[PDB]
């Protein structure tokens, strides 16, 4: 199928911070209208209030290959990457991956 096909993000990885978050599209979408962020969804103790963390969105050689690098070292907790991929033409793919860090 076109669009998002493979990744190496952290799909329910429970153990350790992922080194980086790789996202691999069949379609060369992402002209210049894409982004991603990472929220520390640690514990919904105070009514589901996560905290947005500092991460950089890069790509590999081909602009179909996104590579998100956390800028701040990810500590223990629980965390969701929310990614927002988009093409020139139209047709977003917005999405997320959740993970736990021991």
Swiss-Prot record:
One of its GO terms (biological process) is copper ion transport. Induction: By copper. Disruption phenotype: Disruption of the gene reduces copper resistance to intermediate levels. Changing residue 1 to F: Decreases affinity for copper(II). Keywords: Copper, Metal-binding, Periplasm, Plasmid, Signal. Cu(+) binds at residues 40, 43, 46, 48, 51. It comes from the Bacteria. Cu(2+) binds at residues 1, 91. Changing residue 91 to F: Decreases affinity for copper(II). Its main location: periplasm. The redox state of copper bound to CopC may act as a switch between the possible trafficking pathways of the metal ion. It is found in: Periplasm. GO terms for cellular component: periplasmic space; plasma membrane. One of its GO terms (molecular function) is copper ion binding. Contains two copper binding sites, separated by 30 angstroms, which can be occupied either one at a time or simultaneously. One is specific for Cu(I), while the other is specific for Cu(II). Oxidation of Cu(I) or reduction of Cu(II) causes migration of copper from one site to the other. The availability of an unoccupied site of higher affinity induces intermolecular transfer of either Cu(I) or Cu(II). Belongs to the CopC family. Monomer. Copper-binding protein involved in copper resistance and homeostasis. Probably mediates copper resistance by sequestering the excess of copper in the periplasm. May act as a copper carrier in the oxidizing periplasmic space that exchanges either Cu(I) or Cu(II) with its putative partners CopA, CopB and CopD. This is Copper resistance protein C. The chain holds residues 25 to 126 of 126 of the full protein.
């Amino acid at each position: 199928h076109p669009k998002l096909v493979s990744s190496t993000p952290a799909e329910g990885s429970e153990g350790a911070a992922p080194a980086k978050i790789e996202l691999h599209f069949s379609e060369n979408l992402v002209t210049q209208f894409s982004g991603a962020k990472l929220v520390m969804t640690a514990m919904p103790g105070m009514e589901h209030s996560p905290m947005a963390v500092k991460a950089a969105v890069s790509g590999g050689g081909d602009p179909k290959t996104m590579v998100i690098t956390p800028a701040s070292p990810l500590t223990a907790g629980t965390y969701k990457v929310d990614w927002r991929a988009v093409s020139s033409d139209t047709h977003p793919i917005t999405g997320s991956v959740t993970f736990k860090v021991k």
